Amino acid sequence: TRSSVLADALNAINNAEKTGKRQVLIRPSSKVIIKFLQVMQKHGYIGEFEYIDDHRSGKIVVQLNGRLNKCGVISPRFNVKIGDIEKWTANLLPARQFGYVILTTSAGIMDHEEARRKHVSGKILGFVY
């Protein structure tokens, strides 16, 4: 059955932006989907989006704008130490200075070049480029 809700969300965005649509509807929406999306939004990969509220898990509607090449999830949330940041970003990005690996640290959900500055690490969620 349904296990990763974030994987469903990123796969629905990915499919419905490959084919050229303009706004996407993704049901359910945890706190993690909001924070992962705010990280994608800060860097310009998606437009605004909005959480519509039933009295249930809740749905989101995202406004895409083209600039997104791929996004995904890394499915066992592997613990990542502080050198393994750079082994991870060499495995899953097509050129080692664009795209952001996104990871869950004790100081928030953030990309990797923000977790370099603050000197933290944590688990690993996904990626965008």
Binding site: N69, A90, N91, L93, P94, A95, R96, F98
Partner: protein, 143 residues
Amino acid sequence: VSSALFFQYNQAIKPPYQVLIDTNFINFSIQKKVDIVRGMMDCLLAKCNPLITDCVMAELEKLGPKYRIALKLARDPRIKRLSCSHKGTYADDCLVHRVLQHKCYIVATNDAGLKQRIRKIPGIPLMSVGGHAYVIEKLPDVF
């Protein structure tokens, strides 16, 4: 039969090098996830100056929007853009004319046919991505 060439040494190729990229060097770089500038540093162990020709850039722009990440990689600011005095023709032909007219570039490419036609010309080393990195063939200053 230029004044630099030995029997087959070709000693006008020296650090820092100048490589010419083909259109399917970029594809297999994106596929095997090596990076252009540091990949050539990690094989040649010298500085590099990747160059891309107007015929090749036209070919990249001809692919379309499914291959737009490779185009994003090719418009990168530190890949210089050598301009070429051509009608505007097939890429591999423009590479061969560059090689014959100056004999001081090494050629990074991956198609077998262009590999053969370069190999006839004596003294032109020939990088190509294989496996996991940028293997170089006919360069006598390796290690």
